[PDB]
């Protein structure tokens, strides 16, 4: 079917210069190469944050400590205030 065959061959061929052989695109005056594989190759990381979100920041946990390892001047005040709270108990 020369209807079918010639329509389908032009259907394959006129984008075959756009996809198979990298001859840019004869009918399009803007180019096709510096849009998706060059400019928006950083597209999703122009859609997300670069260098913290996509590099993902393997970050060390900020180390919190115990109560500064001082169990004298605070525990005896706790025991005196506990005398006070038991006088309230």
């Amino acid at each position: 079917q020369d209807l079918y065959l010639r329509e389908l061959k032009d259907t394959k061929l006129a984008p075959s210069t756009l996809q198979d052989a990298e001859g840019n695109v004869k009918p399009w005056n803007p180019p096709q190469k510096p849009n998706l594989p060059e400019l928006e190759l950083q597209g999703p990381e122009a859609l997300k944050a670069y260098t913290e979100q996509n590099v993902e920041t393997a970050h060390v946990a900020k180390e919190s400590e115990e109560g500064e390892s001082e169990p004298i001047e605070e525990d005896w005040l706790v025991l005196d205030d506990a005398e006070e709270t038991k006088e309230s108990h």
């Binding site: 109560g67 706790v78 025991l79 506990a82 005398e83 709270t85 038991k86 006088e87 108990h89």
Partner: peptide, 18 residues
Amino acid sequence: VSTLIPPKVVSSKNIGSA
């Protein structure tokens, strides 16, 4: 900030009360 402790402060409490 920690496990506070008034269950056992009875030893020096037992003077002042009525």
